[PDB]
């Protein structure tokens, strides 16, 4: 539904405990499975920047990445919650600088900034203690420039410059599905696509809880698998027909018995997109 | 010959044994009519109660002194303590007299019961007064019904019903006062 090209920044936005890291971890684990099968030129080296997280959460991730074998390709840049606010503000830029080694020398990178929303809170701390005057939710003025400086470094370079790429995955936490927040609206404007993860879709059973009507890829099907470009266009449209016919039969007013076919097939299709965690396909 | 002592009152007592105790008994159509057949009375001498009905109207329910009913043997008349009667009626004119004044409904057929308590219950389907019938198009379709008789045995009866209805309708517009 929301396919990702090489050199494209894609937002993983959602509430807490909706599976935003699990989408990001499965991108890292899958690159290890793909790096054993491709030639040496097109291998993706992941960088995971963990800003403001627990140190136990980070030690659980390097335990998973060592056990899966994904640690051979992964850099883990860790600015935990006890670190100074300039170490968590600066950790996305330091991880992007490590990831831009692979972009600049013809290889392919994958940077994951888990909670750019926690980088902005650490940048608000330094700004307010350097007595810079606050703005919306006490954030500084240049907090759009904080994230557009960082995310525009994810590029696909020319063949004159090596052809390397860096693919970014910012993670943004919303509060109650409130994507109208200040930092969330900045990053939706910066990134190309958006993977919106929902809480009520998560508990309905649909996990990875992808809001298919709100999730975009601005690159689109130009950089997706041709074996799914012809198959998932049927799947994108049949899920679009699934949505409105499920809003009316939520009430139980009447049946058309020809819209009941699209309610039956998309329910297989919604059940088709479910997936277990830590097993990328 | 009396294997099932049924009735409304018996159905209440047995239904409390099979249904839940939450539900009260369903109602029955005996609980909505107060006039019975074998219940003695309801004649009052001269004028007897006439319940002339249709599916879509109650055309009379007050008392009359005589009812000319168009039975299949022929037109008979009912006085107050008439014999109990289940009379299938032809297409014909029900005459409701109250005295000097009489109202004449032409009906399509359908039964008329005289109950042992003197209650007449005329039960027809379409009961048009002759004031709202026109005598022109009655023979316009009767001449067509006198022509179209194929070997359809279902239309054997339906054309027979078509002919005998208009033919009695022809004869009952002619003698009006």
């Amino acid at each position: 539904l929301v396919p990702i090209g090489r050199g494209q920044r894609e937002l993983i936005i959602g509430d807490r405990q909706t599976g935003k890291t699990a989408v990001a971890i499965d991108a890292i684990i899958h690159q290890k499975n793909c790096n054993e099968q491709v030639p040496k030129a097109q291998r993706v080296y992941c960088v995971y920047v963990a800003v403001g997280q627990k140190r136990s959460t980070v030690a659980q991730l390097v335990k998973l990445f060592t056990q899966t074998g994904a640690m051979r390709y992964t850099i883990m840049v860790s600015a935990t919650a006890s670190d100074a606010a300039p170490l968590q503000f600066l950790a996305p830029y330091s991880g992007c600088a490590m990831a831009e080694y692979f972009r600049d020398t013809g290889k392919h990178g994958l940077i994951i900034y888990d909670d750019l929303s926690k980088q902005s809170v650490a940048y608000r701390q330094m700004s307010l203690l350097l007595r810079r005057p606050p703005g919306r939710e006490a954030f500084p003025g240049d907090v759009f420039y904080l994230h557009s400086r960082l995310l525009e470094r994810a590029a696909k370079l020319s063949k004159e410059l090596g052809g390397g790429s860096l693919t970014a995955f910012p993670v943004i936490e919303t509060q109650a599905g409130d994507v109208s927040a200040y930092i969330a609206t900045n990053v939706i404007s910066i990134t190309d696509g958006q993977i919106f993860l929902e809480t009520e879709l998560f508990y309905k059973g649909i996990r990875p809880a992808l809001n298919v009507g709100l999730s975009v890829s601005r690159v689109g099907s130009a950089a997706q698998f041709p074996g799914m470009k012809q198959v998932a266009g049927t799947l994108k449209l049949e899920l679009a027909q699934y949505r409105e016919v499920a809003a009316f039969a939520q009430f139980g007013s009447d049946l058309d018995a020809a819209t009941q076919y699209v309610l039956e097939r998309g329910a297989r299709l919604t059940e088709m997109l479910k997936q277990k965690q830590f097993a990328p396909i | 010959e009396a294997a099932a002592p049924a009735g409304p009152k018996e159905f209440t007592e047995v239904w409390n044994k099979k249904a839940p105790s939450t539900l009260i008994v369903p109602e029955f159509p005996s609980n909505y009519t107060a006039v019975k057949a074998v219940g003695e009375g309801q004649v009052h001498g001269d004028a007897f109660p006439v319940n002339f009905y249709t599916p879509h109207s109650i055309l009379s329910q007050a008392q009359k002194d005589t009812v000319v009913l168009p039975g299949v043997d022929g037109y008979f008349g009912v006085k107050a303590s008439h014999v109990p009667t289940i009379a299938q009626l032809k297409p014909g004119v029900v005459e409701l007299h109250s005295g000097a004044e009489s109202e004449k409904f032409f009906v399509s057929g359908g039964f008329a019961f005289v109950h042992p308590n003197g209650v007449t219950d005329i039960c027809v389907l379409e009961a048009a007064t002759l004031d709202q019938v026109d005598p022109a198009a009655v023979k316009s379709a009767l001449a067509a019904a006198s022509a179209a008789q194929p070997t359809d045995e279902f239309e054997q009866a339906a054309n027979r019903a078509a002919i005998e209805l208009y033919s009695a309708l022809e004869s009952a517009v002619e003698a009006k006062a």
């Binding site: 606050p134 509060q175 | 049924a6 239904w15 044994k17 039960c123």
Partner: protein
């Protein structure tokens, strides 16, 4: 998040005027169908004093008809007589008889299958779409005499007033399959009447109980249709209250958020001013 609460007041205010329109749509449909349900109440009266009323007979074959609605904002009317179906469909079986369960109304096939799906054989719907006529109720009755039972059961809601709808079981025995067999005690109750038919008494009673079937079916789906409009009226009154109680809690919640965002934007403005002064 101050537009999500404002668009819910968009929803509940439109619902609370939809459901108040459907309250008076059903109220005017209850009154012009009361002038048809009172005229039709007359013709069921002679057949219940000629043939009596015998709900609990030990029929060999029965056809039970639970006549329900077509549209379903009725408020548990189509379920109360589906509940009253098995209350009489378990009661009158004392010997293991055949039963054909019929439903008039599209909300009957979806609820009678939940109880008896192996005895459910007929589904009449689209009845009340234009109006209910006796020729229509005749054709429904002639499809019920294709099967010939010994008894018929009609389950419907009797429209008593706009408030109370006591359900009725109206029973029709087949002409001598049980009908004269229940009158003949120390003689007969039917032998008082002098038959003026063309053919036999056993032949006029064949004509007379089909006419008794079509009459009490025409009354049933006319009593039920006027009972449906009067329970939709009480259902759409209870939902305008529920959409007014919900709208009142949302407006209290909106005013609290309206006051809170004015305080929040002002504290942001004074903090930015105090950082410069």
């Amino acid at each position: 998040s101050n537009q999500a609460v404002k668009q819910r007041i968009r929803a509940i205010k439109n619902i609370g005027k939809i459901t108040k329109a459907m309250k008076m749509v059903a109220a005017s449909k209850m009154k012009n169908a009361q002038i048809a349900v009172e005229q039709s109440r007359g013709l069921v009266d002679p057949f219940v004093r000629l043939f009596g009323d015998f709900p609990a007979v030990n029929s060999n074959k029965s056809v039970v008809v639970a006549v329900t609605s077509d549209k379903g904002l009725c408020g548990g009317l189509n379920s109360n007589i589906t509940k009253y179906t098995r209350a009489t469909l378990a009661t009158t079986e004392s010997e293991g008889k055949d039963v054909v369960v019929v439903s008039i109304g599209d909300k009957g096939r979806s609820q009678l299958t939940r109880i008896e799906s192996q005895r459910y054989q007929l589904a009449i719907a689209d009845t009340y779409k234009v109006r209910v006529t006796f020729g229509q109720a005749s054709l429904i009755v002639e499809e019920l005499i294709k099967h010939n039972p010994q008894s018929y059961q009609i389950l419907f809601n009797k429209f008593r007033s706009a408030i109370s709808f006591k359900p009725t079981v109206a029973t029709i025995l087949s002409p001598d399959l049980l009908e004269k067999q229940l009158e003949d005690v120390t003689g007969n109750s039917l032998d008082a009447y002098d038959i003026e038919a063309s053919h036999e008494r056993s032949d006029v009673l064949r004509d007379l109980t089909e006419f008794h079937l079509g009459v009490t079916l025409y009354n049933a789906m006319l009593e039920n249709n006027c009972s449906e409009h009067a329970s939709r009226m009480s259902a759409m009154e209870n939902s305008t209250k529920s959409a007014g109680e919900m709208l009142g809690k949302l407006t209290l919640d909106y005013n609290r958020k309206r006051q809170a965002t004015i305080t929040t934007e002002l504290i942001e403005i004074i903090a930015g001013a105090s950082a410069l002064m």
